[PDB]
Symmetry: C5
Subunit: 162 residues, 5 copies
């Protein structure tokens, strides 16, 4: 029974000018233990993890003459069909800013007890998704690089071979 903390990049995308209109989904990746690089080498030990805190950052990178914008949130449904504006805006801990403006997400997690390995049902292995989509129309080349700030309490030891 341990307690791990850290900070990890989830994903990164670059968007040229003109491409990246409103509703263009910038990035969409679930919170599976494979993506976090310190926890990916620590979910290969234990079997069950239960998240205590989980916060995000967005940290986009563009000059101050682009002037579009984005929206970011957290959906605790690890489903496979959510491409819209309205569900991201209405969740708890959602932000909206410009492409040179950095915000901070403090979402509403599940506090259940999950499983580390992959399986047939996705609702017991990944406590949420992160969806990011543009809302204006970009002018220059932007560069988003989303982060994560996790803290978890792995238990019941094993050793997987993924």
């Amino acid at each position: 029974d341990v307690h791990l903390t850290g900070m990890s990049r989830i994903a990164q995308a670059v968007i040229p000018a003109g491409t990246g209109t409103d509703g263009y989904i910038v990035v969409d990746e679930t919170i599976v233990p494979e993506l976090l690089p310190r926890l990916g080498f620590a979910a290969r030990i234990f079997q069950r993890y239960a998240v205590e805190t989980l916060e995000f950052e967005i940290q986009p990178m563009c000059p101050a003459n682009t002037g579009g914008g984005y929206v970011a949130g957290f959906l605790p449904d690890p489903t496979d069909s959510d491409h819209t504006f309205d569900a991201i805006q209405a969740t708890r801990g959602a932000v909206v800013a410009k492409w040179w403006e950095s915000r901070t997400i403090r979402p509403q997690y599940a506090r259940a007890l999950l499983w580390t390995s992959v399986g047939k049902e996705q609702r017991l292995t990944s406590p949420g998704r992160l969806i990011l989509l543009c809302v204006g129309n970009n002018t220059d080349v932007v560069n988003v690089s989303v982060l994560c700030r996790w803290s978890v309490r792995l238990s019941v030891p094993s050793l997987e071979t993924p």
Copy 2:
């Protein structure tokens, strides 16, 4: 007897260059339960709602070379003729900023007990309006997207069919 919280976009407008001079009303929409998308599916249950807290944001989106400005407020008169600068400026919880500057409204609500359905008198169904108007003369394409942050205590159950 419940208590709901959330955060919801009210409205959104885009303004080209040249159009949008001083006193051009950018957006003007009352706080009716239809506009908030999580509360619109929850005012269809109950009958009476009484707001506890209600705060706003403006979050406009433009590059830093536009240089106009705006003013935002909250009028607890849900009337149908208010197109001026002076009444918005003089209320409680009014802001003024540039089009690339985001502020936060903490207004003075009514704390009465209202009704959810539409009716002949508007003073018992919507506790205020939101008026937003430009004060300078824009240079580039701006993009405002006002928000809301409501909290309410719906009671006496029913089921409407609007």
Copy 3:
């Protein structure tokens, strides 16, 4: 015996490019009860007012490529000849910033007991002035819009006809 609060614009000026060099007085208006629009309809009732708190804002509006600057203060002498830099800088609660930078004045008032109507002596009807002057040389069109934040305790009822 009452207590009023609020927030009110005092004045507004626009300055083209080239005009508005150093020492050009941007705006200079005393704090008479006529200028505040909610208190102007409330000094017409009572006779004596004594200010409790009084704070200011500047809120200028220009793009981030102008690069001049300003200085703002508060002089509790309601005289009629003060056009200089040194007296504004040396008062209590003075600020200095750029034309796209907004500051906040917390001045040193008089806490005496004044009169509302106009009279032969100016030292009993207006507890200060607001002087604003440029210090650099502007590049683009700026737009200043000074504010006020007053709180006062009107007493001894009457009714004037100004």
Copy 4:
């Protein structure tokens, strides 16, 4: 035995483009009672002053497309030969920023008991210097205007005639 407070500009310089490379000393003036305009008319009364607090600001004024930078500090040696980068950086309460970025110096004074009039030894009449030098290479016309925030306890009355 008194206690005076206030705020005063020390100096001001303007730097054209190209001139003002790295190590170009922008301004260098000691803290003599002559330079502060409210204390200059109050050091002409008393004889001995002992500083209680002393803080600075820099407040430079340029558009956001210049992109050089500066460094600022406080040296409690009122000597007459200090033209370098390393001694300013290594003191207590030193700052570094861009030419459109404003910082705040909270230095380490002497808390001795000095003399107001000029004399043969400089170490008993001025408790420090202020040196400001560029570190990049400017692009546009900048305009620095350093400030001061003094508080002192003049005593033993006299009257000088400087």
Copy 5:
């Protein structure tokens, strides 16, 4: 047995346009007592130093039209082969920002008891490294100037001749 504090520049680099793509290591210097200029004249006295606090700043200097970015961290391995993105991101106290954005590192030191002089093993003379690398593609000439904020408790007197 003493306690020293201060603030010192570690290093400085300038990057032209085009050069300085992603993964280009901007600066990489260990925390040896030679680099800090006040502690370099104080490690020549004592023999053993044990750090109490150690924090960093980045303070980069460019106009707001460059729009690349960086990442900064602290590795308590004073090894000689670490040129990657992933190890810097995953440490404790790592930051990411734009080239006109300044952040602050609060790292995780070793709190052991080291030696001041150079030796055959590097793990007893320098409690960490500082690696800084670009993540976007620069547009204009940037100018980074990293800082340090150390506090240490030198003991057991000697005198080296390096």
